[PDB]
Symmetry: C2
Amino acid sequence: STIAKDVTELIGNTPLVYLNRVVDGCVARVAAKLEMMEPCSSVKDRIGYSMISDAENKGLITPGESVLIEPTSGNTGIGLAFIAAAKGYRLIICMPASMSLERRTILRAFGAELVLTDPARGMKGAVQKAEEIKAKTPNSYILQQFENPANPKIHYETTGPEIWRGSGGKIDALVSGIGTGGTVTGAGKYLKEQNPNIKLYGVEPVESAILSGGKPGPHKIQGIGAGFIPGVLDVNLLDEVIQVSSEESIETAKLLALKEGLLVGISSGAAAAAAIRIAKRPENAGKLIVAVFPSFGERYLSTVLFESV
Amino acid sequence: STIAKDVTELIGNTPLVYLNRVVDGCVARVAAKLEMMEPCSSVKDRIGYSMISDAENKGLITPGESVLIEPTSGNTGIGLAFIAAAKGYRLIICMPASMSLERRTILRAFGAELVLTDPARGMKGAVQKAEEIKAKTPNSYILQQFENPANPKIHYETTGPEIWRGSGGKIDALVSGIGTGGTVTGAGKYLKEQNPNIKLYGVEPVESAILSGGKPGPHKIQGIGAGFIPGVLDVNLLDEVIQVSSEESIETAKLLALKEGLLVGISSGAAAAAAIRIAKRPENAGKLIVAVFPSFGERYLSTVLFESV
């Protein structure tokens, strides 16, 4: 019997797939790591598990005693919420008001408590509110996705090894959109240990290219372009940073659905656009480029449709 | 290397998971077959593949020559749309207007053409429109999900064998919500060939219990209670039909998210409610009951939020 104990044993071991119809002019092969296949449809299922699991293993939290807290407007909240549901933790998510009603409904479905903050104060306002709730709540614990070593650690332990095994050791390049930088840092570190010649390409928005020496700015690429260097990002592991526009990311996501039957988030569009550009460079002829596709595209299409209506 | 050729090689081989916290009073173990893990988040990915693949293998359709047509307001349209995208088929989906705008946006993302029909005429109106488009379109092909033997065949070839292998041959009962009846017929037939003592439980809404001798009626359980006996359903394979209310289905889906961290469609709630009832019967002590969970719950939460707003 191979019946999973619970939903925590369903995380990771996601497939690689070749891109076939969006790669005209490419001299390298491009494969996508499909984090859309995670139980709650994003890469954040991995760090929702690892950050809660690590705290438990260190005796820092207890189910039905500890209150988990995270300031997050994105998939980290959903990854934490389904694990908190399964393991029986109270979870408080802090985010600015007027953020996707769709994401809020999913958090509430898993029984997460929502604390909405002043939109004018943005993410900083949500971080401050999370710290204030922690201060006044005994046995409370903030996961701290941008600083928590369990974030890159799970990518070193699972994501990287899966890409190495799945590619038969043939991966030459990893292309990864940087949010926390946990994926590129953890998976990248593992891959460079297997083959030190592997090149790691960070992807950031043109509109917030802080790793390239640009100013922090607003952009439509959900999940990447945090506008600062996260504690968990090892910039020294990066071999190049590719800038992709929100427009190019949206167009590439549209072509992935139309031509590959892959419905992916805008950040997957960004990673694909960067990987296709790298695969067109003649010095990469015959190589295998692996792009991380962080999320399924239904969440975005739902979010856009609500934001429009 | 285990890199998939394309998205068609990512279908099936979905996990089984034990239910742990919604099974108080159960003397049998309950496991869920998670079709939410399919690439486009429902069981219909299997029959989208099988119905197009079968037509190709019989030389009935050609990519970039043939126009595929199906009248469908549900997941069958999405399953067909991502396969049509990958394989390069023009696809026309006929459905009543005022149906989920969210589902329509997903179909359009995959490049499906939508033909909306008079809401007053319901599904019958969409079926009539599909036949009229077929008549006037050379090289056109209607999949006919309720009559197409490729529907139950894929469940005989994949779904059933996966449940048998995944359960280590220990499955005693399959609990399956009946839409087309392809899942219970195909998987059920295979399972009864491995162990003829296995019992097959069909699930239908209280509000449209036509297999129980009730009248066809409206109900909120998306994917089941078609209000007729499909051509592909073998009623003689069914050992019992369980009726579940829309209210009980919604409450069970809510508890699966809160207690198991499983965000599932209302029809998964129906299947779970039926399986939990069966597992409480003392004559089932020590047995393994497997419930099919046909879809992920994000589509429903999105649909409800739009229908409400």
